[PDB]
């Protein structure tokens, strides 16, 4: 069986089964070369040039390592070569659905452009994966290696987006542990996070003391509360604490960076101003816009970070408004940071209300008379989401007896950089916080 | 003063003047040009761009001058000098085009053989455009720079002298010209960065330590010229440098599939060249091969042109697109063989275009079952350093003693052999079993009458 | 199967047999002896003991055989061999005494000039004492070792052969490369040095540019003049140059430290003054003294750095003279430094003459005669050897390299000059301005009369 | 001025006054006491001693005062202050006994339950003894120190206020309050002492340390917080502090709280107790003290170091046979076996005075199904491990507007290693937990 070997800066040599190679070499997979992992992060962190493509190879690699390690150590689990491939394909394809600049796309842009629509890149990954297998005739290739397509493709989608009393149609309840590999949000520990923790740390120059190889050699499937779940050896606990500290550090230092997130709302603002005028040719030659390409995977296949440059380089005076914001990024005249607040206890601010937020802020009236008035378009309101002692939700096992177990941050920016426009914005913002019952700004 | 965190160097502090230069459309362009060109399509970690490389070299440039200045106040290194050395480091790669070395090393030679073009020339041109467009000269004067001398100094550090040849600095500061680009012994801050950075991204170990070497550098008189010298105990570090360089050339820059892919991208650019319009100065329209003539058009020419071609519906570009679609589907030119010009004169850029027809015209002894025209051949010339003959860089490094600084130590089989090479590879665009068989002996016969080495089996 | 975490080597996995040997009074004894002896009284970070160094050498020893055995199966390296190399690594320093090299390099020579003793000899004796006392031989057999072949192999790996006939009884000549692992006296490259270079550096805060992991990765056993020997890959030459400079740095900065050595002679002076009065109970209940404790391993087992505090804390008025010298160390009233000389182009001083030396200094005739004169008891003469009883050799000569394309066959004033020196220093026990002036003149005359080099100012 | 090369801090410069203080039997003593005590028997890199740690803290304390005095000359920081903070840094651990925290944390409570003893108290006593014994007061005066003003300040920095809501410190006025936050800060637990041993313990244990103290010192400022002058961090140095706290948590989890490490420290303690009666240390006036009584006289205590371990191990004396055999069990690596772990239930802390009673409570527990072995109190070891988010108790300041701010673990070991003794000890232990209402031991 002919394997491709890929040298990876994080995992070293990655061997790829011919089936994975066929899936990798499609316009739909190669597309991920053109989407930055951290999006606007790159404009803060010069080392963060990495793309979704290499990350996905990693997740596919690690996904395989874990199933195979489990299968070798516990043959009773009945893990087939068919299972290993399906877990690897899920690992490979879990991010197919991301759009330009990754989380900026499904996390801010689509909510702003089309508030009524519900879209996640996970939903995209399932759609794009379906599009991928159909477009490139993957089903025969699967059958050749013993995969049964209607049976397994379902499994794969479920590993990505979740169940489409045992909710899963792709595998029976006795293999339930397989669903904990690629995406696990019970305890938020999975091969996806293992790759991007190590890979972001590598490109951001942040210290990562978590050893994922250790964790995989010692992973075991044990019965917990009637349920088969992946468990860690008890003395790997110190390792787990290192993982959680690495994750916290990536969030405070990188994902939540004040300038990083500012720049991402600027790229978003430019997309919104370009949305009317940009045409992406989809299936049947129909034309979609940036916000609608998610509706058709053929158009969406051509929607990547390139759209940034398409806007930047364009001559069309209709795109002038979009273009000048991107030029603002280039010249580094950025939105200025007004303040930060949290919603107290309560309910989370929701994506469908994102569009409404700047108008709420501008409609606040601070109690001292202010001689500057600011429109709602003068404001940017940025909703940043986060996800306890995390070690309690991890299940462990003892060596001597295995098979036995033992959040919203809200920032506001102003497009006006002169002092008393900025002074005004501050007053709007503190007042808005007061009457929406948010925490009082520093 | 801005601080930028970098995975190779850690914290890079930037003087306000540098920040002014960096925050321009001409510098930010380098975010959109991959360092290793087609390398990325082989090494998934090699997503890095010219931008971060440039910040790095500007930073290393600064570290080295500053280190010398503190250890040797007699050198009379001014703060004016250090900023100039930093800007040169920062701007040395400004002239790179889409996919870096693919552009000036193959594409331009194929498109416009008559023209002589290096990205270094581009960097000097682009640096001028950056300064004029963004009014940097007043900002230079503000910080104590004299624009007409210092701008010359900076350009000279990049492309060399435009009987002491340099107009930008006198002969007593000559050692400053050894920092950004050193052509004698190839030891400079530019290589230190991309050695460290490429290794970081390729997952190849770099055993050269630049911090050690910078700590111990001195300027000493050697053959009545001021030169940067290494202390004697650094000999081991320099050998590691020369070996890291070899690994990078052999494992990465010369990678067979990587270079095939660079010829596919180039083949795509050529087939797209007539029909693509880039808007330059005075609203004039330029092509990919022509964008080098105007810095305003060239500012808009980056790797993006690959995707512009790939996503395009225009049927005039269908041919360019079909090659780029081939790369995505991973049906690539197939590799015929490799040969070297031993004892003969190495192939020159102006002759690259002619090479495929020589191959198609070879006429092998046996009758062929399939005939191949030159459309079908790709001939790739791979140079370590183009237009440089072979030198042992260890010779041109001067060392100094603990007990006798300020004077060099007076001056093997374990070093890398080859420091400037020419490799000639041939690929065939037809992938069927008997077309390829044809291509091989066309190639073997082609080698024979140019008296190149007989391809190994 | 125990794993022990180490700050230099990370995780060290220990075969049960090694653990069994380690968990004995004779091995745990090494916890109580400082690696650098008096170095600690100058380098506060140098708290490390023989114990952790020995685990390291055991670890590195195992790493190298395994790397050789796995890459070159033709060498037929057995599990029996790997264990024996590990035991040798672990036990090579068993024989060190209180404050390490102070003990066999100075104290014993001064106490018993007649005796020829090395700590390596000690290691052989202590290893024998260890295996007998703790019933290791059955445990050896249990794991596939043949005790009187292997114990012999292990001892020979430590102390050497017990003309040009093959001297080793423990292993045949086709495995000869095994004897190059723990102790290599031809080129001074072995796992012992690797560990303490890295370990001493770590505690002294000195940078270690030698990477042993790399060297082990690339090591091969090849043909050299009839002879099977461990060889380095050609690209590792830079790493070996770094090893030699680190060694030179450690020797110059730490082992030859002025105060460090003054303090070790003070401790020795204390031991001598205490030697008559301290009984250590050995085998058969017989009583041994500090200097005779080397005669019986049961007594020697209880002889560690502890003897320093025993003397210091003692009430016995017999011990007051010894005690007072150790107390002067605490108060930092030390022997004062007179000067340094070398026996260049002369015959080097031998251990059996050490005691005679102060008498020679005190008997020199300095004159112009001075109003102060000194007895021999007022002088301390310190002989500092890089390698004792070893001729000056350049070690890169005697290292063989190999080429990739010829996997098996073997193929410098940028290097340290210095590989075997004798340094002779003189201290004076009297601290007044005029005695000190007198002692200098005695010393300068003594140098002249032995035709050693003239003391500097 | 002497320079000392140190593997953690690089070159450390020592003022002549400090050198005078260092070169005494009372300070040099710390060369003979392991930082991590029994830790060395688990972690071979942990050979470091109190001596080098104290130089470090003396060095860092100085770096911080000097950085403050220079960036804020309005703050009144004199050279007299800088020297006094350095001495406090230098001498803060003078009071540690054999194997450090084993001595004051377990041994002394077991030997003399009635006595209240901390090594910080020792440090103050030993420091007084150091200055008197060696004639340090004149030397202080040469360099501008006033001995009974300053000695008081130095002691206060170490043991805290000696003798409510008034300003408790006599050694410095309240406008110097920030000085008392440098060497020892109980309030928020961030000081030069921890910085040193976090970095030093990590270096010797091979644990990665991401906290950079040098940056933190560069950005430190004194600001007004609630009536009070206090040391503050620049606001986005918050990230550095999180790394410090992660290092602290890791060191407690991987090292200080290590199972075998602590077990061996109870074995050393058990040997000391059985040796206590018979060992004589000569104190002042030729008076003889015991291991446990040496804390009562600093001249005796001066000669009490890790050496006492070997004195026992090497002794021929048959009264010491019991002590010697325990230490021999350590050497042969036959160790007390781990029975279980529990935590006391809400609020209540087991107190040092009651430690002795704990093995007898356990042994007197009535496990309810009856078992074939009975165990004495001497068969049990009860080990109480005390813990020394945190960002809320740190005060920060803004760059643009500085001046203004923005449990217990209980383990049980059994000394008899035969299998069914262990089954028994387990049942004694689970039951003891039950009727003292501690958390139920995991299975
Ligand atoms: N100016 C600039 N900074 C960069 C770039 N890439 C990374 N950085 C680093 C430097 C600081 C950080 C962002 O700095 P900004 O220029 O956004 O500074 P700011 O915080 O918006 O403005 P200010 O510093 O005035 O508050 O990211 C770049 O291309 N230009
Ligand atoms: N700025 C921003 N960051 C986000 C958003 N959602 C998540 N992040 C941060 C938190 C984690 C990090 C990566 O997200 P995931 O944990 O989903 O990892 P991923 O591999 O990128 O996502 P997935 O595999 O689900 O596509 O990015 C968002 O909407 N906006
Ligand atoms: N197939 C493939 N390989 C990749 C990719 N990215 C990196 N690589 C690595 C693995 C193999 C190497 C390129 O080799 P190819 O797969 O093109 O193989 P080839 O030698 O050209 O043809 P073949 O092996 O089919 O005979 O680079 C990718 O997207 N697809
Ligand atoms: N594919 C390809 N690679 C090249 C060519 N010329 C050089 N290379 C390889 C060998 C070294 C590396 C570039 O080294 P340079 O010293 O030119 O460094 P650079 O930073 O890329 O360019 P600059 O000289 O402008 O700094 O890329 C070429 O024409 N084509
Ligand atoms: N004084 C002293 N120095 C130490 C100690 N530990 C390490 N050192 C370093 C500092 C200097 C070196 C020993 O130098 P000494 O002060 O003993 O000798 P010196 O340098 O000639 O000092 P001086 O000229 O004052 O006598 O070792 C210590 O405990 N006391
Ligand atoms: N002070 C002193 N230093 C010595 C003497 N002999 C050697 N040294 C220095 C030079 C090297 C360093 C260690 O020497 P070794 O190579 O013997 O190494 P070791 O590991 O200490 O002992 P062994 O050879 O038994 O392993 O100590 C001596 O007699 N006195
Ligand atoms: N045996 C032994 N282990 C050591 C030494 N130094 C460090 N270690 C490490 C290796 C294992 C770790 C724990 O010690 P042990 O394994 O002896 O104790 P344990 O693990 O509780 O005993 P066990 O697992 O055999 O019941 O300590 C040493 O000198 N001897
Ligand atoms: N075994 C044991 N460890 C302890 C005890 N108290 C604290 N520890 C651990 C946790 C932190 C580490 C050092 O604590 P300290 O903050 O006291 O630091 P120190 O330098 O050792 O002592 P000091 O407070 O006098 O400076 O030792 C104890 O009572 N027993
Ligand atoms: Fe992902
Ligand atoms: Fe460059
Ligand atoms: Fe050794
Ligand atoms: Fe302390
Ligand atoms: Mg291939
Ligand atoms: Mg900024
Ligand atoms: Mg164990
Ligand atoms: Mg001295």
């Amino acid at each position: 069986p002919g394997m491709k070997v890929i040298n990876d800066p994080i995992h070293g040599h990655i061997e790829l089964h011919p089936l994975l190679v066929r899936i990798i070499d499609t316009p739909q997979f190669q597309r991920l070369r053109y989407i930055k992992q951290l999006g606007g992060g790159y404009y803060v962190f010069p080392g963060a040039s990495h793309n979704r493509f290499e990350h996905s190879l990693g997740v596919g690699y690690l996904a395989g390592c874990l199933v195979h390690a489990l299968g070798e150590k516990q043959p009773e689990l009945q893990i087939s070569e068919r299972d290993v491939l399906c877990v690897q394909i899920a690992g490979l394809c879990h991010d197919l659905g991301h759009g330009p600049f990754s989380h900026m796309f499904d996390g801010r842009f689509i909510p702003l452009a089309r508030p009524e629509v519900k879209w996640t890149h996970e939903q995209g990954s399932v759609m794009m994966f379906e599009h991928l297998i159909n477009s490139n005739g993957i089903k025969p290739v699967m059958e050749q290696y013993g995969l049964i397509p209607e049976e397994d493709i379902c499994f794969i989608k479920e590993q990505i987006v979740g169940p489409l009393l045992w909710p899963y149609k792709g595998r029976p309840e006795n293999k339930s542990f397989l669903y904990e590999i690629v995406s696990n949000k019970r305890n938020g520990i999975d091969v996806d996070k293992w790759d991007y923790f190590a890979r972001d740390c590598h490109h951001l120059g942040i210290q990562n003391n978590f050893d994922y190889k250790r964790f995989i050699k010692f992973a075991r499937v044990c019965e917990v509360d009637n349920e088969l779940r992946i468990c860690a050896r008890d003395k790997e606990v110190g390792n787990l604490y290192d993982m959680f500290h690495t994750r916290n550090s990536l969030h405070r230092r990188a994902y939540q960076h004040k300038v990083g997130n500012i720049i991402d709302t600027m790229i978003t603002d430019a997309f919104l101003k370009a949305d009317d005028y940009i045409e992406i040719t989809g299936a049947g030659g129909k034309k979609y816009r940036i916000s609608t390409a998610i509706d058709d995977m053929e158009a969406y296949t051509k929607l990547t970070d390139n759209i940034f440059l398409e806007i930047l380089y364009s001559t069309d005076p209709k795109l002038k408004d979009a273009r000048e914001i991107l030029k603002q990024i280039e010249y580094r005249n950025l939105f200025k940071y007004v303040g930060e607040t949290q919603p107290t206890g309560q309910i989370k601010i929701k994506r469908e209300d994102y569009e409404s937020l700047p108008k709420e802020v501008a409609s606040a009236k601070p109690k001292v008379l202010l001689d500057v008035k600011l429109k709602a378009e003068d404001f940017i309101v940025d909703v940043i989401n986060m996800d306890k002692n995390p070690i309690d939700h991890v299940s462990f096992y003892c060596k001597t007896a295995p098979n036995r177990a033992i959040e919203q941050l809200i920032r506001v920016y102003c497009k006006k950089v002169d002092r008393k426009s900025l002074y005004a914005a501050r007053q709007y913002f503190v007042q808005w916080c007061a009457d929406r019952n948010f925490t009082k700004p520093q």
Side-chain angles (χ1 to χ4, degrees), chain A residues 1-14 16-71 74-80 82-149 151-168 170-184 187-206 208-212 214-216 218-222 224-226 228 230-232 234 237-257 259-285 288-319 321-326 328-345 347 349 351-358 360-364 366 368 372 374 376 378-387 390-398 400-403 405-418 421-439 441-442:
Chain A
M3 312 297 271
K4 303 272 175 77
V5 177
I6 285 199
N7 189 22
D8 179 67
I10 271 73
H11 310 300
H13 297 290
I14 296 182
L16 293 173
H17 181 288
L19 172 59
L20 311 172
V21 176
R22 293 296 297 276
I23 290 178
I24 283 164
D25 284 331
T26 65
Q28 286 73 35
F29 196 96
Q30 295 290 315
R31 167 179 179 267
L32 298 173
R33 283 177 181 278
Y34 313 110
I35 293 162
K36 285 305 188 285
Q37 182 87 0
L38 299 190
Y42 182 44
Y43 292 83
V44 170
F45 305 94
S49 69
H50 56 310
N51 305 305
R52 286 282 153 191
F53 175 80
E54 43 271 32
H55 165 66
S56 306
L57 290 173
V59 183
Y61 166 77
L62 291 181
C65 289
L66 187 61
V67 280
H68 181 91
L70 296 180
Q74 306 175 250
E76 56 281 13
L77 291 172
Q78 287 285 301
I79 294 167
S80 72
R82 173 154 153 251
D83 290 330
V84 172
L85 281 183
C86 284
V87 166
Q88 282 181 301
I89 299 182
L92 231 38
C93 298
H94 80 288
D95 277 346
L96 277 182
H98 264 303
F101 301 93
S102 296
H103 292 281
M104 190 211 67
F105 201 75
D106 63 345
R108 161 167 268 259
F109 176 71
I110 293 309
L112 287 194
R114 307 173 63 183
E116 73 285 8
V117 154
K118 276 141 199 245
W119 165 264
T120 56
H121 62 273
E122 288 96 338
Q123 267 159 243
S125 301
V126 160
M127 291 180 68
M128 181 64 70
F129 176 68
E130 176 70 23
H131 185 221
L132 190 157
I133 67 174
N134 292 334
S135 301
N136 308 283
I138 293 298
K139 278 155 149 170
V141 193
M142 295 178 61
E143 287 173 306
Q144 175 179 349
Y145 293 98
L147 270 65
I148 302 111
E151 297 181 39
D152 290 325
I153 280 158
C154 175
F155 179 31
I156 286 158
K157 301 186 184 184
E158 288 174 342
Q159 280 169 87
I160 292 173
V161 83
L164 303 170
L165 178 63
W166 171 250
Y168 291 108
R171 283 296 190 275
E173 169 159 8
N174 55 291
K175 268 152 176 192
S176 70
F177 56 95
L178 293 186
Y179 292 99
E180 288 195 332
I181 298 178
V182 167
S183 184
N184 197 332
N187 71 354
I189 304 167
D190 51 51
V191 297
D192 178 31
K193 279 160 182 53
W194 295 348
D195 185 86
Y196 78 72
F197 291 165
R199 183 166 307 262
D200 294 351
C201 281
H202 184 74
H203 294 281
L204 295 162
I206 287 178
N208 173 30
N209 312 102
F210 176 61
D211 179 15
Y212 64 80
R214 222 184 57 112
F215 194 94
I216 296 174
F218 291 0
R220 276 191 67 99
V221 174
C222 36
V224 179
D225 293 1
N226 155 1
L228 285 183
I230 299 188
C231 304
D234 50 90
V237 53
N239 198 24
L240 286 180
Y241 278 114
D242 284 336
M243 201 202 73
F244 289 130
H245 168 79
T246 286
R247 148 209 157 214
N248 280 15
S249 292
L250 287 168
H251 277 78
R252 139 188 61 88
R253 290 167 184 274
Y255 310 152
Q256 288 169 17
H257 194 273
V259 184
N261 288 285
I262 280 177
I263 290 178
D264 261 3
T265 73
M266 301 184 57
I267 299 175
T268 283
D269 196 32
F271 283 20
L272 291 168
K273 299 190 175 358
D275 196 36
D276 288 335
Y277 314 113
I278 292 286
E279 299 173 27
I280 297 122
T281 299
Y288 300 84
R289 331 191 289 163
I290 297 161
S291 48
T292 64
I294 56 172
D295 296 332
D296 178 43
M297 291 302 96
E298 187 165 327
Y300 197 56
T301 294
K302 302 191 304 179
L303 189 65
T304 68
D305 294 13
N306 166 86
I307 205 68
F308 176 107
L309 291 180
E310 201 182 321
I311 298 175
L312 187 67
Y313 294 161
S314 72
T315 56
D316 191 327
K318 291 178 172 177
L319 288 171
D321 289 309
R323 209 167 40 242
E324 222 78 354
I325 288 163
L326 289 188
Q328 283 184 258
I329 298 173
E330 283 208 318
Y331 288 107
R332 210 71 174 197
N333 296 315
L334 311 179
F335 296 167
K336 275 208 171 28
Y337 170 85
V338 178
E340 178 171 277
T341 182
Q342 321 181 38
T344 55
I347 311 305
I349 294 199
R351 248 128 98 133
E352 47 188 347
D353 306 318
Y354 284 178
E355 172 170 5
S356 71
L357 300 189
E360 294 188 7
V361 173
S363 81
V368 127
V372 188
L374 300 164
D378 293 11
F379 287 99
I380 288 291
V381 196
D382 197 6
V383 175
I384 300 176
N385 302 280
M386 34 262 223
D387 294 5
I391 203 64
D392 293 343
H393 303 262
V394 181
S395 303
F396 296 83
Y397 73 89
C398 183
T400 64
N403 295 333
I406 307 303
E407 291 181 342
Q408 213 171 50
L409 199 129
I410 305 160
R411 286 167 186 164
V412 163
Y413 322 138
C414 184
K415 307 185 185 178
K416 300 300 199 55
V417 288
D418 62 274
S421 285
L422 274 188
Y423 182 73
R426 176 69 175 185
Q427 303 309 319
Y428 283 92
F429 171 64
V430 180
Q431 183 56 45
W432 176 68
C433 290
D435 50 55
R436 212 174 184 275
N437 288 285
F438 298 162
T439 73
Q442 132 58 15

